[PDB]
Amino acid sequence: MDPYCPFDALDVWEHRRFIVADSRNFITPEFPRDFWMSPVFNLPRETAAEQVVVLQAQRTAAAAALENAAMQAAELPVDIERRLRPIERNVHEI
């Protein structure tokens, strides 16, 4: 698991003034690596398909209530013509 590197180590001392050819070192933490713990990404069990099932069941349940309300409100036009026509005839009797 060691990355390949031909060269071991080299040395020409670090005078703060004489910095030339500005490269950048690999910045590392001071803590032992063992707690830089492992990669884990876990799925939500509710799947893109499962939410489809749940929301479709909800849509189909709501459609029944919408149809119930429509059929409750679809009888009012029958009520108007069932209630007012006899009243119009009674007025006509005069």
């Binding site: 803590f31 713990m37 069990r45």
Partner: protein, 147 residues
């Protein structure tokens, strides 16, 4: 002689430049923040599980122990250890009202459970607190006192 007992600081610190986050932290951007990581700050949303082997997968990734637990959970000595540090409580301690943790990814708090390693931004959130005020120099006469 003359009185000065009990009346005024209310034209006064309802004040604006304390919530303060643009330019101060700004003026000290660019380093590398001293030895400090999570203790824990990220967040999440459920766990698609049910309460007991809760036991089993939440402490056994709290499995293998670091090498010095370092800068927030002290609790027992007397006073002027506020005053010569063996011990940390001051570079996460200088004034509370802006006081500005290390801080991984604002974490898109909250989601699921399992781990990467730590990047923050810069800072804001208001410890509106000032009265066990930050701290480490104290005794028990002056607030079993306020009682």
């Amino acid at each position: 002689l003359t009185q000065l007992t009990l009346r005024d600081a209310m034209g006064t610190i309802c004040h604006s430049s304390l919530l303060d986050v643009e330019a101060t932290l700004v003026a000290l951007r660019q380093q590398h923040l001293d030895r400090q990581c999570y203790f824990g700050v990220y967040v999440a949303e459920g766990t698609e599980d049910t309460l007991d082997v809760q036991m089993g997968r939440f402490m056994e990734t709290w499995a293998d122990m670091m090498p010095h637990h370092p800068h927030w959970v002290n609790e027992h000595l007397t006073i002027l250890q506020f005053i010569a540090p063996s011990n940390p409580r001051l570079r996460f301690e200088l004034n509370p009202a802006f006081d500005f943790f290390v801080a991984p990814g604002d974490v898109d708090l909250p989601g699921p459970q399992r781990p990467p390693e730590a990047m923050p931004t810069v800072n804001a959130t208001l410890r509106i607190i000032n009265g066990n005020i930050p701290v480490p120099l104290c005794p028990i006469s002056f607030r079993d006192c306020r009682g």
